[PDB]
Amino acid sequence: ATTYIFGKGGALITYTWPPNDRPSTRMDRLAVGFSTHQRSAVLVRVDSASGLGDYLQLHIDQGTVGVIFNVGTDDITIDEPNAIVSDGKYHVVRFTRSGGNATLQVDSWPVNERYPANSQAAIKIGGRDQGRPFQGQVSGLYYNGLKVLALAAESDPNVRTEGHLRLV
């Protein structure tokens, strides 16, 4: 329930687990609040051990939200192509992984992805080097117990700050 505004140039909020507490999880929850006017941006990126690719991606594409996450080799996508999100108004996204199974809630639209038959390293919010970079405001981010936005506000050493930010 803390809000950061990402200005012109795009900002970045990195939470970095110490190289000794890298959580290898059976289940993940991401839940973000935000608003933006652009139809193409990246919100939350979660990195895996060095050189394994992205563990979790949350991006706005075509004005709708979508998550990519990997089950070892393959990366699984979940699209919510019904909720328009690039209006500038408030929107709450809730990704819920459980093994291969997964759920995606955007505002009032839920999607359920069900499976057929990896240690985390960092969480980045926004991105300053994918021109056009993210612009707008993110609010009350939550990942596996970590309220990363709050942890910034209280200057947690694990949280590195880059870009054009403002606590509102």
* Amino acid at the residue 44: V
Spatial strand order of the sheet with 91-98 comes to: 109-113, 101-106, 91-98, 29-35, 136-143, 3-6, 165-167
Q: Resolution for this model in angstroms, one decimal place?
A: 3.0
Q: Which experimental approach was used here?
A: X-ray
Query: CA separation (Å) from 7 to 78, 122, 127?
Result: 28, 22, 11
Q: How far apart are CA 36 and CA 23, in angstroms?
A: 31
Kindly list the domain boundaries of the chain, sorted by start residue: 1-168
Q: How far apart are CA 89 and CA 124, in angstroms?
A: 22
User: CATH for 1-168, among 1.10.3720.10, 2.60.120.200, 3.50.50.60, 2.60.40.10?
Assistant: 2.60.120.200
In 3D space, the residue among 147, 33, 143, 28 whose CA is nearest the CA of residue 93 turns out to be 33
Query: CA separation (Å) from 10 to 4, 24, 149?
Result: 12, 30, 16
> Cis omega (within 30 of 0) on the bond before 22?
no
| Phi, psi (rounded to 5 degrees) for 148 | -55, -35
Q: How far apart are CA 18 and CA 12, in angstroms?
A: 19
